[PDB]
């Protein structure tokens, strides 16, 4: 016989913070030996990027 109008919340996530990682800087920075040792692993860096 009687009706009640009520409001309820419902929270949904949409997106997290976008991330971009420096690959050869994080692996080891400022070393030519790092370049000569990382360029011979093929593509384990471009795939991640």
């Amino acid at each position: 016989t009687n009706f009640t109008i009520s409001v309820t919340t419902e929270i949904l996530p949409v997106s997290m913070t976008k991330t971009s990682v420096d690959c050869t800087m994080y692996i080891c920075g400022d070393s030519t030996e790092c370049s000569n040792l990382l360029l011979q692993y093929g593509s384990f860096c471009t795939q991640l990027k």
Partner: protein
């Protein structure tokens, strides 16, 4: 396409004072020395050598 990283222009190094002022002038410049058979053993420690 890549990453941008500015390179340092020069290098500096810091280190503490040279204290204790390690005694090398009493051994290398003395008025009297010992004999070859009775040589005196001198030890220098607790001081950064120059």
């Amino acid at each position: 396409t890549s990453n941008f990283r500015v390179q340092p222009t020069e290098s500096i190094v810091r280190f503490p004072n040279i204290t204790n002022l390690c005694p090398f002038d009493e051994v290398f410049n003395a008025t009297r020395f010992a004999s070859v058979y009775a040589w005196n053993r001198k030890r220098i420690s607790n001081c950064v050598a120059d």
